[PDB]
Every structure is written in structure tokens, then in C-alpha cells.
Amino acid sequence: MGKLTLLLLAILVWLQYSLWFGKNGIHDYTRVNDDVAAQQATNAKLKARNDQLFAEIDHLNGGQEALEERARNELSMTRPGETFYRLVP
Amino acid sequence: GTRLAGILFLLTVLTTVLVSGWVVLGWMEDAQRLPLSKLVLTGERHYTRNDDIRQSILALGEPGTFMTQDVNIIQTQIEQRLPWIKQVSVRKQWPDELKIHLVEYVPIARWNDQHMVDAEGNTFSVPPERTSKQVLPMLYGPEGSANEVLQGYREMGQMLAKDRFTLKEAAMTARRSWQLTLNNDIKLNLGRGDTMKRLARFVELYPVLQQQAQTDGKRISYVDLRYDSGAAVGWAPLP
Amino acid sequence: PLCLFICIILTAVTVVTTAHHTRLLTAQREQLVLERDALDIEWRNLILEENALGDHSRVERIATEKLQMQHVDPSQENIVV
């Protein structure tokens, strides 16, 4: 009678609890998914940070647009035939 | 006497249903087996043409019918052949009728002389004959960063448009350096640093750059802005 | 009844589907830690290569190699805001 129903009813109740908690359950999937999302978001910025620097390193060892800017921005030296203007507040 | 009427009244109506159902079946069996040679293009089409959808749907090498055609295979084939379409929605209607809904990309700039980019940052390609009439800015940059250069174009463009300038080209390098091109081929060689404050310096410096260029009868070739509160200007003879 | 018995089946399958997908994310979370360590080490060696190439004594050495001259104060037009 009701014992046959109460048996399979309590099994589904305990089976629900093991789905939410425990190992690799719902909350484990939720917490790990949040961590994996934040890591690949950070690794995307780091990879862009490394690629942007590697691109300049490519133009540093006798390149073009990474050595002339350092000559202009840091050493204030120009090219011949270029009128140099200076802005003062 | 009355039951014979009710029998005949029911049998005749029964006969009229089957006979009418037989010719209706004949109407629906000799019509549902057709290659749906019709086509309805409902949408704002500016680049795609009526012959483009027809030629692309028959490029599969098979004239599909009604019950023997998957719309998911048609919408994908339209996507694989028309890069300027954003959303394809091909649907079947009746025995010999089709419905294809198309949505195109609205180009606001040109990406690497061969592609285009819209406002939402999406990239696509259009043949040069269907877009040569458009006067659009030409954005350059490394692959995958069309939206980033678009953010720079707007920010540098809104400031430049304040003092009635026209930003024609905006190029970015893999190391994130900018080199703008204005009207009359005025190359603004920007740098990797504070780009907006270098560009704002050229705006304040320009009234003096032009009044000196007319003194010697020279043309502004390029204005290098890779300094701190400074700028080197190259010249060229005017034609 | 035999109606709730099938919910056990639907839940047991959900457990396997949830556990299988979770152990895949754990293997990827560990791989992202190894990727970040490789990026940082790559980042460290890159900023060291920048100084050996961005050295002013080396920058000025090659700047004058392609016809560049230091800024001269007399030929420097000044403009006030």
C-alpha cells in the first residue's frame, strides 16, 4: 500500500539532495563555472597584454614604429626638414 | 419511409464527402509535389539582388521540392554564399511558394580596403561594385580588433569633428599605435600613449601650422605627434 | 505509484549529466592555472627584452643611424595656449 509509495518517494528525496550538494553536483558545477569564467577573462587580458608587448618587441630589434617613437617621445630628437613646435600652457 | 430518407440523406452526404474528398485529394496530391520555383524576398535589400538568392539556392545542384527540402540547409547555403547577410530565414508556405527573410549589415566604415564594419562591430565583406558609391571612412587594424578601432574612430572623430575636421582614415597596429589621415592627405602620426590628448594638441596647434604653411607656399605633408607637448611637422610642395 | 519512479530515472540521468560536465570544468580550471603561469613567465621575459632594446644608449645609437638629430632650442617654435 502506502509503504510501496513511501519507499520510492524517499529515494527521490534523497536523490534530490545528492544532486544539489555533494561532489560534482549542482553547486560544485556552479562554483567551478564561475571560477573558469573569471580565469579565461583574466587570461584574455594577459594574452592581449603579452601580444601587445610582443608586437612592440618585434618592432624593437631594429624595427620601425617602436624605435622612432622612443627617439621622439623620450629623446625629443626629430628628423631633418621637420619644423618642431612646442605647446606651453 | 422516413428511415429510408435518413439513410439516403446520410449516404448521399457521405458520398458527397468522399467524392469531394477524392478530388480535393487529387488537388493536394498533384500540387504538393512541386519544386517550389517561386520565391518571396521580404526585407530591406540594398546589396543582395533577386538573382543572388535564386543562383545561390540552385548552386546546390539539386531542385528541391516541398516535402523534400530542409530550410535549415537553404538558410545555411545563403549564409555560406552571401557574407553581407546577418539573419537568413527561409520558410516554406504552400505547394509552390517560398518565403525568405533577409537582414543586411549597414556599413559605416571600410575595414582593410576589402571588408566593411557596421556600428555593432560586426565584420563582413561586400563586392566593390555594390559599395563604391559610398563615401565611408577606412579603418585599418590587426585582424579581430575591428570593434576596438571603431571605438577609437568615434572618440578621435567626435573630438576632431568639433573643430570641423574630417577623419578619413584611422589605422591601428598590433602594438596599439594610431596613425590618422585627414582631408587633403594630412597624416597625423599618433603614438601608443595618450592618443586623445595628442590629437587635442594638434587641434590647438593647427591654426599656427596653416598660417606658417602659407608663408612659404608649402603643403602640410604629415604632423608627427609622438612627443610631450610637442610636434614635428613635415612639408611638401603644393600643385 | 510508478509515476515518481521515472522521476528517479530523470534525476539519476541528471546526476550523471551534471557530474560529467563538472569534472570537465575541473580539468579546464586546472589548465587555466597552468596557462596563467606560462603567460606571467612569458610576460616577465618580455619586459626584460624590452629594456635591452629600449635602452637610451642603444635607442640613440640607432636613431642617428637613420638620420635623426637632437632638438635644438633656437630652431624650436614655441606656442602658448
Author numbering:
A (entry chain B): 1 to 89
B (entry chain Q): 22 to 260
C (entry chain L): 39 to 119
Q: What did the paper state?
A:
The essential membrane protein complex of FtsB, FtsL and FtsQ (FtsBLQ) is at the heart of the divisome assembly cascade in Escherichia coli. A core complex at the heart of this machinery is composed of three type-II bitopic membrane proteins, the Filamentous temperature-sensitive proteins B, L and Q (FtsB, FtsL, FtsQ).
Finally, it is important to note that two CCD residues, FtsBE56 and FtsBD59, are buried in the FtsB-FtsQ interface, especially for the interaction hot-spot FtsBE56 which has an accessible surface area (ASA) of only 3.8 Å², about 2% in ASA ratio. Crystal structures of FtsBE56ALQ and FtsBD59HLQ mutant complexes were solved, revealing a displacement of the FtsB α2-α3 linker for ~2–4 Å. While the overall structures remained almost the same probably due to the stabilization of crystal packing, the coiled coil might be more prone to move and this tendency could be transferred to their C-terminal linkers. Herein, unless the FtsBLQ complex adopts a different conformation in vivo which exposes FtsBE56 and FtsBD59 for direct interactions with PBP1b or FtsWI, the only other possibility for these residues to affect cell division should lie in the FtsB-FtsQ interface, which connects the coiled coil to FtsQ. Mutations that disrupt this connection may detach the coiled coil from FtsQ, and the coiled coil may move accordingly to fit the short TM domains of FtsBL in a less tilted orientation in the membrane. Although no conclusion could yet be made, the CCD residues, FtsBE56 and FtsBD59, are likely to function as a negative regulatory element to allosterically prevent any undesired movement in the balanced interplay between FtsBLQ and the PG synthases. Mutations of FtsBE56 and FtsBD59, on the other hand, may induce a conformational change of the coiled coil to further enhance the activation of FtsWI, impair the inhibition of PBP1b and promote constriction.
